[PDB]
Assembly symmetry: D2
Homo-oligomer: 477 residues x 4
């Protein structure tokens, strides 16, 4: 029977008494795998108030002790890696290999963030006043909130809660309505190790209800969210009411530039190895491929060939496939319309292009050629495993077309010339630029997007600092 | 005849052709000293588009060259210090000594920010990938905007434009509708030295018109503003539409804690020397004074006495006064209502308390005693030179009442015990904490408020970084 | 039978064929517990050449992989904590509780240093040259050497090898001639986990022979040593021949200042809890106690009383004692002469003072009063558990007498006044200053002494950086 | 009449009463241009004691005030640029254009170092102890000393005194025996502006006398010196006696690598524009040129041609020459022997090679071909304007031969391939690596050599920090 999940508030699971429920489905089979409460603002507040009551003592704990708690959580996750991976596979529809890697990476991530305990520092600044000391301490924000999407849901829990908890903050996470299972599992692990009550809270429900509360509540020092530009806009607008800080990651349209002097094998491999790191969906995966004439011909063929081998199907019954289904009906439909609409503007369907009609939501890896910068397929979050390929004459053109977007999170260039690389770097307006390799942010790097791609960022030292604020003390004599 | 100011766009003053005009008045005499255009969104866009066209080349300039331009501007300001001070005095109504100091400080500030040219740095992070380099470059945001208030208007130009220009950004400033004169003077200096066209733009008008455009325009990478929580809320909400970054400083209710073991002379002096650093108005000046029983009696008397000597009048005709008039009618009225409303709740008028009726907007330094944390005078931006004094029993009480506010920008404590100081520091939830001295942020410190007091910050290295974003490059082999 | 230890070179223990041997004795029983080769320069070179051959590949390993090796070593140490502690107790003569803590701390230390893998960074500096990038990479020094003393020998292995190995260096350690056993045990653990050959090398022998080679060999990029000023002088002088970098920690005469307004209980406790963290010997333990008249009387009595409870004896047969014997005959004799010589100058023996004559080398906790800054007991490395107590009138006096020394490693002050603390801090010329607590350097702090106390330092980020050098790259276009 | 210079000690020039004098000569004309005292240790001590008496108050000054003094000195230097340049030209024998640039750069340098006043910072580290603060303050070393060489003597005054003075140190400089005039001029400027007495001291004499005292005096916290490896060895060995810190820059044998895919014009230009930035003498100038077969032929011809245009002669009577004479007879002779000795081993004299016999010390730009890594001309400080050119087959060869040296200060590579550049960077063991440009260290970079090239470094933030030490405060509650 499809299990009914309770929320995790103030150190204890609480059974939802409400009358309405949200059904969680398997994108592959399309059946009901579980049910979560249709939580409301009042639920979020219970969690926020608990987070608030527990924040002073949690922060009073030496950073090293907080790191210790984080290590117990990562340890709990490893002991249950397969159980958690299967949940990710089941509700997210991502291939088994990917799920396992997500679970391992998330545990390695929490451990990497635990290591900041004795390393984040404040500063001692020289004053102009005789005998005066200016101390700059790094304090915690207080209560923080996390609103996660269905892509990489398990990891996104750690990316937000780990930094927050290490710095002395308390957090209230709202997993995605479509992928709440891994979150429940995470809360079970938090419960087992016994993390202090209120430090970590999990509230189930919809973004418009539980999400808006996680952003508009006056007690929240900062609301962190990952997803679509649209939701980021509603979250920032609501946070505005209380001058609440925000941490947004709205992905985008990752562009990739392939020069003639580029290792043909590497580029094709890297772009393919990227793109479908789920079903395609992932935003840091080359959604816009720019190729110059001199190599266009060869590049397209190898690429076209590489994409055919990519088979799709139920992730749980197939460990030999490279693509699971899409997260849901809405996602599948939008991919069709956008592809169809694209072909009407001149898009040349070189591969796939026709939505599969049957149990689950699948879309064959599609390849669009003769695409133009002007076309609407270039200025929208594609979703599906679609790859538009626009030809270009020179680096200046390529850089100009890549920078031509409302998104500026991830970019990549495949070349071999010292000036081209350095010129592309200095020219590309993105938070990230991969040179001759696949797009996958390192935990010690800094995931932050320019323009509409976001505000603030994640990972590494700067990601950690997003959860700290400063207290400048002017100690006169 | 009251002069009519043109706007400064794309390297040249432009005469406003519109039919409507905004009258600039002298808070002291109450007469019309000049007129500024009632600018509209389209005006702001002309400036933004110019700022956008000029940004690439400006950033392409070596940081040292940009610093050079900034030094010419500071040099221009010093050559015209008196002229600019008198403008500040005239329209802002602040005492002459204060105006001169503002002009000198602002010039020293621009020079201090110019020194960051060769000092702000990116980082080289160790990768887990064999032979891979992770470079983290600091790039400019692009086009930025500044929306200034009437308090410290001249300096606030530099606090926003200096950091922005040094890092490679272009800016569009909208001075306050009540204090645009000093801004025009600043633009004249920018024009004289010949700063590259578009790098610095000045647009006149109202916040609801020209301000909303400076915040909602998709071409703006970041909008910086200083003023009231209310305006910050409208600015952040509008910036939300384009996920535009924001830099807000909404002042607050600066609290001050006086312990018994506190140098009575110093505290009284510091609190008085602060408070009226204009007419009172300044937000970093002890608006909430907490005193403990053991010293309450003596502290109130010396304080009461110190406040009587504070005389008010026209800043231009009086260099022996300690207080000019309030910025305008609205400000004066609110101060009255709030004082009256306060006395009804139990507030004991120990000094002043009655609004002066005549040319200009003056309010005698007022002292409210027997005030309670509960009273509404404690939870609002007082404006006028009013000082509520609430008694308290112990440090825990004092800290708890100081932290009890929607604002968390500035705080201060007067004591002598090593544990008290360290306990107050660790306990106070403010961006700043002054110990045994008056509240005046150092240029190399970091002016940033907790809670509703703001987002991001200003001054020092961290202030400089608010104008930089990161570009993480993954150079694989 | 007293075991004969082989050296650990190029990933394998090697049996010493030489004819001479150095006898290792138990300071408590005075019997031969083991024997180590009387190594010569040629032995050190074999190790250095191995370290050199292995350095390129070791450094080529991603920092995270090197950290992984370090974690295996710490894990090995914990699995054998008791075995290693007993060795420390046996040859070093330190009380059991201390040995266990040393073994645990050293393992926690290696793990703390392993966490620097993805955190130490180079920088990207703004150039004045159009289109030029200045990259500042942090590279490894190459081959490094460590020369350890008998105090905290086990930990001192990790304090030198952990930072070196994490940054990509290879190392050659020479344990102390009197305490080589724990080192052999450490090498066995390195061997078991299989650390790459040459990365870690252990060479046994005397300082004048194997030590001089570890410092004068042209292949050594840096020689790190901990011990007496005299040895530091011979090591630096030899390193001079090849402009070899040096890292010295020569301890000193840690002074402690007790003010009248100081928690009498805390000070007496902290000074006693310190001093004898072995037999006394430790250099960071208040070897010079300054007390002011107003509290002198009481402080001396409680202190005198606290010292009587400190019993001495064989660490292995007594877990109820607070002091083991001294490292050897020479140390015991010097303590006597210095005490006797001190009493002749006016020193008042308030407790102990008479060397015990029998198996082992013991010296009763001794207390010298009426001591004067002038006396020679204040300007020499006391060694034994002796405590001179000099009276003083004011802070200026106390600070001046504390700063009056050739050593500037550790200091401490017990007071409660905000100005006194801040005044003592700004006045004391030491690398460390403890306020109201016992002297024990934190792993994330920075152990570095002023004047003759050393060069460079250890622990924390700065300790880590001593093993890194910079490579500034000027990439023009 | 050849003027006789007095020393500058404790804020006042002091006339040398000794009987012996050292004659200063003009390398071009060879006549006596002035005379300096043959100072002795006692003279150096007078300066050190003055530096010591003045250090506390100087450091007590807010950093900004010290920076102010530094700006007055730079201002003084500009007002007397020509006077100072002519002195440099006269005694150093460097071409006029170079002297002027040195004087301007040194003044810009002092100003750049003055900007560190409010920027160098200490840190606030997280402790594991409940309620404990770890403050890490940056304090001054105390008294420092500078021992300068004849190359870039004026600038080397600022490179050592500017960082030292800004951080709160006092200094005692000993200019080079052959180039003391510019130093006297600098002291006159220090005197005119009125720098506090003792902060800056100038002592004339020989290295073996006044230099040894500047290094062996127990009151010196650190001795900074620039010159030959030999002198560095004597200075470090002497400093060893008191565990005195040292800052050495012993230049070396700067190698340069020219790949086939390298802009022939640029490389030839850069190597020529470098080399003779005086008479040749400069150590950061390609003293070892590595060229690969594929381009060897062409590279040698253009280079040979470029070197012919380089004319030599008296710098004061010729503003159309590219090379002045050598510093003295000894330097000229060594250049001959080494060239002659080189030709005997197989060196092919492609240009120049014969020492000019007449007034002054000149050596025609010489070009040695068919040189082998083995030859002794590759393993010695050439001095003269000699250029050995060794052919090589691949990058690995080139990198291996460049790294094959006891010196590791400066390196350069001329290529265009992204992998070659990145491979050369990661492979070259030098403190600096220039890519496609001439060798000239930036003031905000970091001049520090690997191996025998030095200890510590200069310029930029890290150069500044060499003059600071740390004070870790453990404030428990
Ligand atoms: N009504 C519908 O049918 C719609 C469905 N979608 C789905 O969302 C996908 C988009 O990708 P995704 O990465 O999930 O990103 P989203 O932008 O949808 O954001 C997902 C996360 O943001 C929360 N959120 C959504 N709206 C708000 C809001 N107004 N205020 C606060 N939080 C909010 C979500 O809640 P929650 O999980 O409750 O959505 C979830 O936690 C689509 O592909 C589609 O599957 C998108 C729009 C409409
Ligand atoms: N006796 C002779 O004839 C010798 C002359 N030289 C000259 O020195 C040049 C080397 O270049 P340069 O850059 O000047 O570098 P050096 O290594 O000669 O060092 C020059 C600076 O170091 C000082 N110094 C030299 N020896 C010592 C010492 N033992 N202890 C402390 N300080 C010392 C010098 O003093 P000072 O200026 O007094 O030398 C000077 O301030 C040669 O080309 C040659 O012209 C070198 C060796 C011997």
């Amino acid at each position: 029977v499809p299990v009914q999940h309770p929320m995790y508030i103030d150190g204890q699971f609480v059974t939802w008494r409400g009358d309405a429920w949200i059904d969680v489905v398997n994108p592959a089979t399309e059946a009901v795998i579980s049910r979560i409460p249709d939580g409301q603002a009042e639920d979020a507040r219970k969690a926020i108030d608990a987070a608030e009551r527990a924040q002073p003592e949690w922060e009073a704990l030496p950073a090293i002790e907080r790191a210790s708690w984080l290590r117990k959580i990562s340890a709990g996750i490893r002991e249950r890696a397969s159980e958690i991976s299967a949940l990710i596979v089941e509700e997210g529809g991502k291939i088994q290999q990917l799920a396992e890697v997500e679970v391992a990476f998330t545990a390695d991530y929490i451990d990497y963030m635990a290591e900041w305990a004795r390393r984040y520092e404040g500063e001692i600044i020289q004053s102009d006043r005789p005998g005066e000391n200016i101390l700059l301490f790094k304090r915690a924000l207080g209560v923080t909130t996390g609103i996660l999407p269905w892509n990489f849901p398990f990891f996104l829990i750690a990316r937000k809660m780990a930094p927050a908890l290490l710095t002395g903050n308390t957090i209230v996470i709202k997993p995605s309505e479509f992928t709440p299972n891994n979150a429940i599992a995470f809360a079970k692990i938090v419960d087992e190790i016994g993390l202090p009550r209120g430090v970590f809270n999990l509230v189930l429900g919809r973004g418009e209800t539980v999400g808006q509360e996680l952003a508009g509540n006056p007690k929240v020092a900062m609301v962190s969210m990952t997803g679509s530009v649209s939701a980021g806009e509603k979250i920032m607008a609501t946070a505005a009411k209380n001058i609440t800080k925000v941490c947004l990651e709205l992905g985008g349209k990752a562009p990739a530039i392939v020069m003639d002097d580029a290792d043909l094998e590497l580029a094709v491999k890297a772009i393919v190895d990227s793109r479908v790191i789920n079903s395609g969906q992932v935003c840091n995966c080359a959604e816009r491929v720019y190729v110059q004439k001199g190599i266009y011909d060869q590049f397209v063929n190898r690429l076209g060939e590489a994409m055919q081998a990519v088979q799709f199907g139920n992730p749980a019954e197939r460990n030999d496939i490279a693509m699971g289904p899409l997260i849901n009906a809405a996602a599948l439909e939008r991919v069709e319309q956008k592809v169809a609409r694209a072909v009407e503007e001149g898009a040349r369907v070189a591969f796939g292009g026709k939505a599969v009609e049957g149990k689950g939501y699948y879309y064959p890896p599609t390849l669009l050629l003769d695409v133009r910068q002007e076309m609407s397929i270039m200025h929208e979050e594609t979703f599906g495993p679609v790859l538009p390929v626009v030809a270009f004459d020179t680096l200046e053109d390529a850089i100009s077309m890549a920078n031509d977007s409302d998104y500026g999170l991830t970019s990549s260039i495949y070349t071999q010339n010292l000036n081209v690389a350095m010129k592309a770097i200095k020219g590309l307006k993105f938070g990230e630029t991969y040179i001759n390799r696949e797009n996958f942010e390192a935990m010690q790097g800094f995931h932050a997007g320019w323009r509409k791609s976001g505000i603030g960022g994640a990972d590494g030292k700067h990601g950690l600092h997003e959860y700290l604020q400063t207290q400048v003390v002017y100690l006169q004599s």
